[PDB]
């Protein structure tokens, strides 16, 4: 059995996380278990960098008016 964090979101973000896992963007393969098309299993020790990457992807194609 595994101990960690289940992450649920739209399939686009799941595919983005899979691309990050295969490209070693975070430096390792910590995206370990895939259970569903919209659910993934991730070790909680580095969830913060995943949030940072998601935020960077989100605000990259945003064109903030500030």
């Amino acid at each position: 059995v595994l101990k960690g964090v289940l992450i649920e979101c739209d399939p686009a973000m799941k595919q983005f996380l899979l691309y990050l896992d295969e490209s070693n963007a975070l430096g390792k393969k910590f995206i370990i278990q895939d259970i569903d098309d919209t659910h993934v299993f991730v070790i909680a020790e580095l969830v913060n960098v995943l949030q940072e990457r998601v935020g960077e992807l989100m605000d990259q194609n945003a064109f903030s008016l500030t």
């Binding site: 059995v1 295969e22 393969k29 370990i32 278990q33």
Partner: protein, 57 residues
């Protein structure tokens, strides 16, 4: 130049119909499990070196 263009416009037509699958399958084919302390079991993927550590009840 027109001859070169009219052969080029059909040169890539046959080429585009050759390749079928672009995405590479990344299935994790773990081998035999290794037993560590505290009832820990580790599986190593033979395709990319992926490691999965879990606890078996």
């Amino acid at each position: 130049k027109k001859f070169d263009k009219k052969v080029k416009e059909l040169r890539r037509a046959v080429r585009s119909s050759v390749w079928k699958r672009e995405t590479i399958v990344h299935q994790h084919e773990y081998g035999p499990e290794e037993n560590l302390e505290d009832d820990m079991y580790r599986k190593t993927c033979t395709m990319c070196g992926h490691e999965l550590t879990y606890e078996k009840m």
